[PDB]
Design an enzyme around this catalytic site. Structure first.
Site, PDB file in Angstrom:
ATOM      1  CE  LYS A 115       3.698   2.326   8.220  1.00  0.00           C
ATOM      2  NZ  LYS A 115       3.232   0.919   8.077  1.00  0.00           N
ATOM      3  CG  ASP A 145       0.281  -0.780   9.423  1.00  0.00           C
ATOM      4  OD1 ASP A 145      -0.340  -0.865   8.342  1.00  0.00           O
ATOM      5  OD2 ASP A 145       1.199   0.048   9.653  1.00  0.00           O
TER       6      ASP A 145
HETATM    7  O1  LIG Z   1      -1.221   1.633   1.293  1.00  0.00           O
HETATM    8  C1  LIG Z   1      -0.151   2.216   1.611  1.00  0.00           C
HETATM    9  O2  LIG Z   1       0.626   2.749   0.801  1.00  0.00           O
HETATM   10  C2  LIG Z   1       0.235   2.278   3.054  1.00  0.00           C
HETATM   11  O3  LIG Z   1       1.426   3.052   3.191  1.00  0.00           O
HETATM   12  C3  LIG Z   1       0.534   0.861   3.530  1.00  0.00           C
HETATM   13  C4  LIG Z   1       0.821   0.820   5.027  1.00  0.00           C
HETATM   14  O4  LIG Z   1       2.109   1.378   5.322  1.00  0.00           O
HETATM   15  C5  LIG Z   1      -0.275   1.547   5.799  1.00  0.00           C
HETATM   16  O5  LIG Z   1       0.080   1.525   7.171  1.00  0.00           O
HETATM   17  C6  LIG Z   1      -0.575   2.968   5.313  1.00  0.00           C
HETATM   18  O6  LIG Z   1      -1.730   3.481   5.963  1.00  0.00           O
HETATM   19  C7  LIG Z   1      -0.895   2.945   3.827  1.00  0.00           C
END
Ligand SMILES: O=C(O)[C@]1(O)C[C@@H](O)[C@@H](O)[C@H](O)C1
Ligand SMILES: NC(=O)c1ccc[n+]([C@@H]2O[C@H](COP(=O)([O-])OP(=O)(O)OC[C@H]3O[C@@H](n4cnc5c(N)ncnc54)[C@H](O)[C@@H]3O)[C@@H](O)[C@H]2O)c1
Ligand SMILES: NC(=O)c1ccc[n+]([C@@H]2O[C@H](COP(=O)([O-])OP(=O)(O)OC[C@H]3O[C@@H](n4cnc5c(N)ncnc54)[C@H](O)[C@@H]3O)[C@@H](O)[C@H]2O)c1
Ligand SMILES: O=C(O)[C@]1(O)C[C@@H](O)[C@@H](O)[C@H](O)C1
Lengths: 282, 282
Positions: free
Chosen positions: B72, B109
């Site tokens: 990220k 998020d």
């Molecule tokens: O559901 C997941 O596995 C996610 O990785 C959870 C979270 O990290 C979100 O930001 C992603 O878009 C999706």
């Protein structure tokens, strides 16, 4: 009901009917299906090497690819496995990607044209056939013809060397002298003596109006095929039909290559009539 | 009814509910949707650099990606544009890919957690809040908290430097001293004096049973949030509910990050109840 991800690597893909056929048939069998053009003339994929694009499909979870011009020969050495027919032809149009990323090349142009003969010319006499045109499409068509019962195929191209190269490849693939290159000049006399003739040139398309040879050499007893699928009734096929000839239009190959690829990609039995109706609707 | 192609780049993605949410919602809006895991621990994508995978998605016609751990932060310099919030947080979880391949990073998020507060804690007192945990998820949660009305957020982590780094990033993003790092040791006394507390640690998961602090510091007047979404009712939230506290479970953020990403990816207005029901069904 796992979703299905497919694409087509090639140049100038906007008008392809293949994406729509696969998307509709996957959905009809309860599996959301995306089929993307991967067009190296377009904004997304231009400048990228074939290997880069193939590898990309592996990494991002594609279940299969079709491959079109100019990549059907170039793709072979990039694949893990290649079917015996595609190997011997030296051309792949279909790549099955296993769950874990392994690639197998196939040629559904060959199987599709052959199926079109079975479907649309079930009673055709196949002892002696002429094919005009030895380009890319023509190579698959010739292989299909001589593996689906044609005893002698005479192939003419303006570029004699293309016809001769084709003949060598196909004869090696089948293990007999099935194909002979013949001159394009005077091809009418060769056609007149044959049982059937297939156009594998661009002639008949809106941008290539006319026919690849003088249709006055046809008789009522010939059958006539054409690879051109738009228009469906080319000038050639119109002339043949006027004499009462059986005809094989180019949509049969175009649909069946997709039927056979869908089966290979998914393990599902495609519904031919649905895929045909998608094709004709576009 | 153009098909939609999405994916998630990260590690250890098998149990993600995000693919199912997007696939179902696209289909519910009449658009066949494929959402692929692009898991660099798995057979397809392992060993590949983030840029390779991002570029692959561009070439092969993806309309969007989510990005998860460990990418990220790493993804930001690879993108053409990044939203102001994602830029200031230094973390992107959503990449919109334009028709012609341009990438824009966003952070849903942050927006998703904020929406969860609006949806599930509409009456919560926000003057003073404690957050336990300053990892990846915690960074977005803290930013959401202080942009959705929290005046003072005290963030504790076993690794004090993580908490302090978080505080610096968020305070710079909002332009005030909204966040202060505080010691994890003795956090119960800090929580006891605050209006609410959010768990942003793994505690409460099946493999991390228990709570991140002693729940005897809670009172009936606190509200309590948890980022853990499996189980939905963590030991922490059970303890809070036993006192009559309002609680915010981790599914709200998990659903709303996907709602907001779907909107960004497609331009369609997602149906929240449908996406919630998909999430809960898995
Ligand atoms: O559901 C997941 O596995 C996610 O990785 C959870 C979270 O990290 C979100 O930001 C992603 O878009 C999706
Ligand atoms: N039905 C299908 O599934 C399908 C799929 C793709 C293409 N096509 C059709 O197939 C056609 C041929 O495609 P291609 O990629 O092989 O094209 P190509 O240009 O590679 O090959 C065509 C060949 O025809 C030869 N030719 C042209 N006019 C001739 C003539 N009068 N006499 C003898 N030879 C002549 C050329 O020298 C050339 O080698 C396309 O124009 C298209 O209409 C059909
Ligand atoms: N709801 C959602 O949308 C969503 C999405 C992804 C992850 N999660 C959940 O968020 C949790 C945290 O994820 P992460 O990626 O930030 O994990 P992480 O391991 O990167 O960060 C967790 C932090 O908690 C700290 N910590 C652990 N126990 C503590 C304690 N007793 N006191 C103070 N600090 C403590 C650690 O030092 C660490 O910095 C995950 O375990 C998962 O359950 C929720
Ligand atoms: O429909 C097309 O555009 C195709 O490219 C036509 C032909 O080349 C086939 O072999 C491909 O699978 C699809």
């Amino acid at each position: 009901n796992d979703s299905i991800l497919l694409g087509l690597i090639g140049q100038g893909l906007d008008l392809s009917r293949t994406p729509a056929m696969h998307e509709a048939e996957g959905l009809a069998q309860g599996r959301a299906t995306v089929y993307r053009r991967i067009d190296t003339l377009g904004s997304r994929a231009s400048g990228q090497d074939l290997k880069t694009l193939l590898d990309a499909a592996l990494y991002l979870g594609f279940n299969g690819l079709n491959i079109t011009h100019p990549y059907k020969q170039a793709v072979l050495p990039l694949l893990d496995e290649v079917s015996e027919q595609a190997t011997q032809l030296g051309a792949v149009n279909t790549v099955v990607i296993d769950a874990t990323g392994h690639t197998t090349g196939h040629n559904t142009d060959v199987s599709g044209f052959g199926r079109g003969m079975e479907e649309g010319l079930p009673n055709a006499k196949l002892d002696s056939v002429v094919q005009v045109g030895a380009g890319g499409v023509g190579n698959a068509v010739a292989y299909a013809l001589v593996t689906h019962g044609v005893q002698k195929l005479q192939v003419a191209d303006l570029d004699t060397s293309r016809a001769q190269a084709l003949a060598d490849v196909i004869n090696n693939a089948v293990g007999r002298e099935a194909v002979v290159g013949v001159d394009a000049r005077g091809i009418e006399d060769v056609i007149a003596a044959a049982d059937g003739v297939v156009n594998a040139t661009p002639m008949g398309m809106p941008a290539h109006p006319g026919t690849a040879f003088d249709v006055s050499c046809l008789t009522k007893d010939h059958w006539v095929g054409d690879v051109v699928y738009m228009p469906i009734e080319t000038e050639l096929l119109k002339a043949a039909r006027a004499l009462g000839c059986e005809t094989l239009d180019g949509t049969r190959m175009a649909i069946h290559q997709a039927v056979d690829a869908f089966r290979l990609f998914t393990g599902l039995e495609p519904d031919v009539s649905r895929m045909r109706e998608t094709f004709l609707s576009l």
